[PDB]
Structure formats: structure tokens, C-alpha cells
mmCIF file of C-alpha atoms and ligand atoms in Angstrom:
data_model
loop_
_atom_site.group_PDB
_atom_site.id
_atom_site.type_symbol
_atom_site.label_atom_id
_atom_site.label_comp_id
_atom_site.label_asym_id
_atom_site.label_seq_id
_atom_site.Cartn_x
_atom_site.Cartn_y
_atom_site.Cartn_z
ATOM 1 C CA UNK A 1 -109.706 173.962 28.294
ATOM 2 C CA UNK A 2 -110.496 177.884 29.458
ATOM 3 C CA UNK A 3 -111.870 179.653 31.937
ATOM 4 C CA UNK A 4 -115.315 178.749 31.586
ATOM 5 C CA UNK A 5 -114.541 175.040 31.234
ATOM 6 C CA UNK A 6 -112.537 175.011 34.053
ATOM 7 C CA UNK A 7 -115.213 176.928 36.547
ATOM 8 C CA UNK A 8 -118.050 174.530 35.132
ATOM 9 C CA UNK A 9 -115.834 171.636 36.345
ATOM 10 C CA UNK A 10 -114.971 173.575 39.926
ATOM 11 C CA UNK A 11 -118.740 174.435 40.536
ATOM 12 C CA UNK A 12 -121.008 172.428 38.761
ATOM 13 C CA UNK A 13 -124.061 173.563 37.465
ATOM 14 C CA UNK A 14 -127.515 173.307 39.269
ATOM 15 C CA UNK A 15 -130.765 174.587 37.978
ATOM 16 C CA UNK A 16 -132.591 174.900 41.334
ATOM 17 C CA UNK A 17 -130.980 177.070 44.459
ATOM 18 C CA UNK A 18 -128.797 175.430 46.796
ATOM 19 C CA UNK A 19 -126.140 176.136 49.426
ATOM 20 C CA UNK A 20 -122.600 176.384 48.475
ATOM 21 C CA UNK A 21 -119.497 175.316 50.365
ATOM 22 C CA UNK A 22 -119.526 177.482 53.180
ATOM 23 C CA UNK A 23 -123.899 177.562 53.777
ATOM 24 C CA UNK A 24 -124.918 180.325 51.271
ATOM 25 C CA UNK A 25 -127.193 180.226 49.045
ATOM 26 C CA UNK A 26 -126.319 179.677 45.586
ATOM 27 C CA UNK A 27 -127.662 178.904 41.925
ATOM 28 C CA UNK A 28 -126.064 177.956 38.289
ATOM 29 C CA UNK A 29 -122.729 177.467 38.384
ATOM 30 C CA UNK A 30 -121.341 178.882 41.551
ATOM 31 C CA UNK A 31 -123.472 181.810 41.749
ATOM 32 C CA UNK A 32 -123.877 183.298 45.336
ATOM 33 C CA UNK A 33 -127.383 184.999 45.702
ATOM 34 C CA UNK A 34 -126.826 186.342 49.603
ATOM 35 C CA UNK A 35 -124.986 185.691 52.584
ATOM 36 C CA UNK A 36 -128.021 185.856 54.562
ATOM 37 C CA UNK A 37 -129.834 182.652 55.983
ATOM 38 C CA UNK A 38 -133.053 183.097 54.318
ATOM 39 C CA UNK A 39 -134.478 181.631 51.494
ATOM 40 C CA UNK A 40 -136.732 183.831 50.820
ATOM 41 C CA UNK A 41 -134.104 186.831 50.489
ATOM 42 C CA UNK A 42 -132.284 184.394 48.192
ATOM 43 C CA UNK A 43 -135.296 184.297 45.723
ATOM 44 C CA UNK A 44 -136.030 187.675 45.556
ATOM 45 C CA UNK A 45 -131.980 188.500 44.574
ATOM 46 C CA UNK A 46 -132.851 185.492 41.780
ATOM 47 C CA UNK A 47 -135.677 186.978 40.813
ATOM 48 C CA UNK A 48 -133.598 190.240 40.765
ATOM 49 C CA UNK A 49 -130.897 188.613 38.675
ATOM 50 C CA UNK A 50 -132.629 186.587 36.554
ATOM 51 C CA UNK A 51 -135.717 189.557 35.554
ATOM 52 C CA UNK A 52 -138.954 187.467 36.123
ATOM 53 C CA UNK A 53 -140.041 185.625 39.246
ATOM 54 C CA UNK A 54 -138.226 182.413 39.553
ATOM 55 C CA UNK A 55 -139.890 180.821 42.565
ATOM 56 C CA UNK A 56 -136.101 179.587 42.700
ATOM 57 C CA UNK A 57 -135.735 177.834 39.191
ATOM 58 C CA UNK A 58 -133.938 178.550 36.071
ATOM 59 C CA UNK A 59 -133.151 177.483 32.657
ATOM 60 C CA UNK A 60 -129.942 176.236 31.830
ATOM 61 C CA UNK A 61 -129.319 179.464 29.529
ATOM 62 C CA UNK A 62 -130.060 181.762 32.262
ATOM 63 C CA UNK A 63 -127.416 179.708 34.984
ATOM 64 C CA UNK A 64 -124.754 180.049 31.492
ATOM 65 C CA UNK A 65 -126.249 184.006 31.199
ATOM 66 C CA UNK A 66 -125.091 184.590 35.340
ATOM 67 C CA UNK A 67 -121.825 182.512 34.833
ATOM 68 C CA UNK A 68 -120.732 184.931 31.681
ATOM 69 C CA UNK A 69 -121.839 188.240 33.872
ATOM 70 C CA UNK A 70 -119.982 186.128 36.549
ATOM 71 C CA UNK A 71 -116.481 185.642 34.801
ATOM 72 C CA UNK A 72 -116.642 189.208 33.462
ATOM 73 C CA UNK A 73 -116.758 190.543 36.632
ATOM 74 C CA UNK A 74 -114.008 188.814 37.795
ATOM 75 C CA UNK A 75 -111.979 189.725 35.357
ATOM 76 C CA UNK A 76 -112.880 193.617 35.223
ATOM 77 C CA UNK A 77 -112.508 193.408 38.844
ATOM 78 C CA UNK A 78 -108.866 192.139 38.846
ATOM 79 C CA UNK A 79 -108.143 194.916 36.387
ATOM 80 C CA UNK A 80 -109.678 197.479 38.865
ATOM 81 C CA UNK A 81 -107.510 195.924 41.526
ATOM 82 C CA UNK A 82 -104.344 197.861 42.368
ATOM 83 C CA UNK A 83 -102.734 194.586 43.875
ATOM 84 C CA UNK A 84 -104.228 191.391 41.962
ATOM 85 C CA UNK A 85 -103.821 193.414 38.216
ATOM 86 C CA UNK A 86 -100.243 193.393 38.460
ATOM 87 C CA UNK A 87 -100.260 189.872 39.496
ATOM 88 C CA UNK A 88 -102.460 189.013 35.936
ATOM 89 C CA UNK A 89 -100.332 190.815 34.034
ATOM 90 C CA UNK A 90 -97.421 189.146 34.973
ATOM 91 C CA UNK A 91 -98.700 185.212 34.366
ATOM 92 C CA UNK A 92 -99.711 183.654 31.322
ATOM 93 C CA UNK A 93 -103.015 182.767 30.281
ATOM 94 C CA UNK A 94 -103.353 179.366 31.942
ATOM 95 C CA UNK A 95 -101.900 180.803 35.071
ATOM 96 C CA UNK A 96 -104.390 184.044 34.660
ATOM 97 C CA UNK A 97 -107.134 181.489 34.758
ATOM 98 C CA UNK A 98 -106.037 180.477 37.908
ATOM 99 C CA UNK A 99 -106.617 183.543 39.632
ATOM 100 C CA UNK A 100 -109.845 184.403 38.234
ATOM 101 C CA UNK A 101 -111.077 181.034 39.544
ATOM 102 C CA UNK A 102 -109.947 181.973 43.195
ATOM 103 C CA UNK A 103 -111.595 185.534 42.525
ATOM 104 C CA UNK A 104 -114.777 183.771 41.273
ATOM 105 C CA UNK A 105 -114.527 181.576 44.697
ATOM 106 C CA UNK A 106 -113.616 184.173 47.412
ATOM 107 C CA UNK A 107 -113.903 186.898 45.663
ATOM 108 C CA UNK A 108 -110.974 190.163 45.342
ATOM 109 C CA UNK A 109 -110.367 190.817 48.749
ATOM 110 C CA UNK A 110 -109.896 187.618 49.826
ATOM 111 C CA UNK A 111 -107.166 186.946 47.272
ATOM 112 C CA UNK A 112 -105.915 190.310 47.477
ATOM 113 C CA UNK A 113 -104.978 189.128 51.374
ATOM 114 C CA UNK A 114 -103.029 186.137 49.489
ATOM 115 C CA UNK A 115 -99.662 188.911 50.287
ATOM 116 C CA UNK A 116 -96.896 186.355 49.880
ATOM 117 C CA UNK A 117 -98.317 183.775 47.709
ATOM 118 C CA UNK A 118 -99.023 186.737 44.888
ATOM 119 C CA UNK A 119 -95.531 188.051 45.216
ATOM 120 C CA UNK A 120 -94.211 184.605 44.756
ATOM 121 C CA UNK A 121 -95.921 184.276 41.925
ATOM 122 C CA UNK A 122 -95.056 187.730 40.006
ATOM 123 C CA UNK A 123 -91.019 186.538 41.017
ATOM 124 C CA UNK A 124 -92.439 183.191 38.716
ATOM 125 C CA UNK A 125 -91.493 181.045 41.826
ATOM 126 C CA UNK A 126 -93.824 178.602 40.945
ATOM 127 C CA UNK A 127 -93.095 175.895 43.916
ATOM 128 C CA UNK A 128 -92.510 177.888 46.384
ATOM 129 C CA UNK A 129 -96.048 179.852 45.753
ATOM 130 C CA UNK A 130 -98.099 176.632 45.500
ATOM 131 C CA UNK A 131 -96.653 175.832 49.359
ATOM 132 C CA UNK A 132 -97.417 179.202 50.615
ATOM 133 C CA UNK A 133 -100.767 179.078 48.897
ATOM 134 C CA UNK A 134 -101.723 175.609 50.707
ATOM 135 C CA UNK A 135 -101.507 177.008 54.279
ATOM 136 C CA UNK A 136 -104.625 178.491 53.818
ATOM 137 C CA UNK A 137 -107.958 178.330 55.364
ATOM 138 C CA UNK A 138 -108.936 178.192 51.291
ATOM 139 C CA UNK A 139 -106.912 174.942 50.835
ATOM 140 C CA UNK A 140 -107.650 173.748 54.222
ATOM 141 C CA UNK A 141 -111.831 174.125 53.163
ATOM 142 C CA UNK A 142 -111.779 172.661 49.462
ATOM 143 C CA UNK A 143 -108.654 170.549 49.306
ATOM 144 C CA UNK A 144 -109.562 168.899 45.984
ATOM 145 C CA UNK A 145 -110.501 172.585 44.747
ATOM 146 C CA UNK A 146 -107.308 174.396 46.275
ATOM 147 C CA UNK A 147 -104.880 171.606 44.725
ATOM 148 C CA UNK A 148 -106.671 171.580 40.802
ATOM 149 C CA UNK A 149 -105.760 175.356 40.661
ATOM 150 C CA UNK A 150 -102.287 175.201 42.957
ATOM 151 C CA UNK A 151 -101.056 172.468 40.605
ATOM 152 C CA UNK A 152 -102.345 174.835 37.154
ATOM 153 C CA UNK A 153 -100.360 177.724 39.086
ATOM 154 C CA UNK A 154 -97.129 175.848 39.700
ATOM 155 C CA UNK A 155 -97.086 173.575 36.041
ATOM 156 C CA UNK A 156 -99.146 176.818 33.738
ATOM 157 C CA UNK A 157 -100.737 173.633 32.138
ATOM 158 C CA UNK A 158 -104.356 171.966 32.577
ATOM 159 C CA UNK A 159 -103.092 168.765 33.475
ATOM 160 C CA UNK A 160 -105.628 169.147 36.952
ATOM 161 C CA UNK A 161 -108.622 169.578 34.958
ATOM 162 C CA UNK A 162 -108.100 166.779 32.113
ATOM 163 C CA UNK A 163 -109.164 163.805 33.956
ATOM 164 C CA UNK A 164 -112.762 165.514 33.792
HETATM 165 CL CL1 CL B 1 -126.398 189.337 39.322
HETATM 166 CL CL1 CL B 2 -118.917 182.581 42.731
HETATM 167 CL CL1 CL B 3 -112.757 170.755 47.298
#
């Protein structure tokens, strides 16, 4: 199991664009095109991405090329971060994959905001952080999501994502 494994389980993969979660739509695996209800501003960001004109389909190499700029990004964007880079560089790599996968889902800010549950986690008080990070309107939205990556947070092991 790694990073990419693990987001492939947590998002799927789709070829044609559909909405996400929370009513955005979305391509590949977990890629957010806009924010903005229509469709036809969500195609012309694929198009952007993608270099050719999609009429909203891709190839299964092109949703894989997104998810590796995708993951990237993440990751050079948690290392820009003055409060989620100390937080990587404190965990292991199991638990570092943790984080990017709740970047890759709400993106920096919104884990940035996670104040208590990331200095829980830099102390390495592993059950106490996966309690503060449940009362959230995160866990509260994907349960089955928020509890895979809580429970690779509080054990540093994959045992969440090997039934899969
Ligand atoms: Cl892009
Ligand atoms: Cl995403
Ligand atoms: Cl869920």
C-alpha cells in the first residue's frame, strides 16, 4: 500500500465527469474541475487540463496523468505550508499519507484549520488526535472516509485499507 493506492481506493476512478461528495464537479480519481454549477464551465477546465477537447471524457492514462499532478501538489503544498509541514515532518510515512489524503480531499486550508487535532498529532498522541479529529464536519460528511484515515493516523499501519 502507498499513497496512490490508498487515494484510488478513497476516490475511485471514473472516466466520464461526475459530481463529487459535496455537488462539484469532478473527473478521474477525485479530481475537482470547478466549484461552479455548470457543466459547461466544468468541460472547458477538462479541456484545459487534459490539452484537447474532451466533450467530458478521458482515457484512463489521462485520469492516472491528473491523479500524479494531483498527489504532487499535495505534497509540494504541505511543504509550502508553514503549519501542515511541520506536522509531515514529524509522522512517519504511513501517517504522512494520511495527511496528504485529507489535503487531496479538502484541500490545505481546510486541514490547516484542523488546530488541535495537528498538535495532537506532532505530541504522537495518537488516540487522543483520532477523537478530536472525528468531531468534524469532515468525519460527520464521509464517515467511512474520515474513519479509514483516523484509524491509519492512530495505528501508522494500513490495516483500514487491506480489506480492499
Ligand atoms: Cl489541472
Ligand atoms: Cl481532490
Ligand atoms: Cl465516506
Amino acid at each position: 500500500m502507498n499513497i496512490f493506492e490508498m487515494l484510488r481506493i478513497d476516490e475511485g476512478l471514473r472516466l466520464k465527469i461526475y459530481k463529487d461528495t459535496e455537488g462539484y464537479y469532478t473527473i478521474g480519481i477525485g479530481h475537482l474541475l470547478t466549484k461552479s454549477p455548470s457543466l459547461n464551465a466544468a468541460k472547458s477546465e477538462l479541456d484545459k487540463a487534459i490539452g484537447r477537447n474532451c466533450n467530458g471524457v478521458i482515457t484512463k492514462d489521462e485520469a492516472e496523468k491528473l491523479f500524479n499532478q494531483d498527489v504532487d501538489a499535495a505534497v509540494r503544498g504541505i511543504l509550502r505550508n508553514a503549519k501542515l509541514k511541520p506536522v509531515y515532518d514529524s509522522l512517519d510515512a504511513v501517517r504522512r499519507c494520511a495527511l496528504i489524503n485529507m489535503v487531496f480531499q479538502m484541500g490545505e486550508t481546510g486541514v490547516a484549520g484542523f488546530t488541535n487535532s495537528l498538535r495532537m498529532l506532532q505530541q504522537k498522541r495518537w488516540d487522543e488526535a483520532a477523537v478530536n479529529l472525528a468531531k468534524s464536519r469532515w468525519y460527520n460528511q464521509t464517515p467511512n472516509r474520515a474513519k479509514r484515515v483516523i484509524t491509519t493516523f492512530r495505528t501508522g499501519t494500513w490495516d483500514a485499507y487491506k480489506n480492499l
